[PDB]
């Protein structure tokens, strides 16, 4: 619970998530863009207006918030094994001579 470091009383507007995308992300895909999402057919020319929205939205993290809305840093370690020789092995402690 990274409450102390990432919480701004004003809010830390620098942490954000994507509210709307046309399709579910493919596994391990990375997607970074600012493109307007519409509901109507109008192109809308990239303005904040009916059927025009900015897709990223902030988490508004703020200290006086409950456990549910508090920063939680996540580290997803994965293990990749290929036909090439392995190079990341494990301390392998020993015995005295």
């Amino acid at each position, epitope marked *: 619970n990274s409450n102390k470091l990432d919480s701004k009383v004003g809010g830390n507007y620098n942490y954000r998530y994507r509210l709307f995308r046309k399709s579910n992300l493919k596994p391990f895909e990375r997607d970074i863009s600012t493109e307007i999402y519409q509901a109507g057919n109008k192109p809308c020319n990239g303005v904040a207006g009916v059927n025009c*929205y900015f897709p990223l939205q902030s988490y508004g993290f703020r200290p006086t918030y409950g456990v549910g*809305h508090q920063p939680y840093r996540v580290v997803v370690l994965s293990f990749e094994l290929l036909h090439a020789p392995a190079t990341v092995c494990g301390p392998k402690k020993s015995t005295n001579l």
Partner: antibody
Amino acid sequence: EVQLVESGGDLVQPGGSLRLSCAASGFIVSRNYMSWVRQAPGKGLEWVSSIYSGGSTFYAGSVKGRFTISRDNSKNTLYLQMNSLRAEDTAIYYCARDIPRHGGDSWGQGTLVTVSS
Amino acid sequence: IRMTQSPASLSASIGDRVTITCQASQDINKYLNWYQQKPGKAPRLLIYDASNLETGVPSRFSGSGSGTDFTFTISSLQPEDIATYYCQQYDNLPITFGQGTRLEIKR
């Protein structure tokens, strides 16, 4: 105008299968969040199902596996296939588009389902 | 969430100041919408997020809250204000509405 004629259903025996249809004026069904509320006569509105902008489906506890939701790109017409019905499902069903955080809404007039014997 | 609305029969004369209180069982932060359902006609969305009244509404309805307890206010009770108002939370997957507060007018 976001006006909805979500008009399908009138009634069946217990154990039947009805098919609702919703409809759409300014937007496309498959691009915006939509859901289906359920208002029993004289009772607080209860939430049955909800679709997302990428096909994610979420249901309610009482409708796990009897109800289905389905989205139709060709003619709008957000479809909700009611199956495995019973004698306590009688309620008014309203089609609903919810834009999640920026705030607008469509709740269409809604249709009556009285399913009985 | 066990949504709780405390006033169900509340009756004020023409042009009065009333208040509706919707209460929850956890922290829903600010994601609680206020609806207005006239008899027969489909519900309208009045205050999304608990702090933002939708444009085009008359400008009397105001709401403010955070975390569990929320409140809804009516600034000028025009005669054409008879309806039933609902509070909805839209970010916890078991979306549960509230009971409604049937408002009436006295003369």
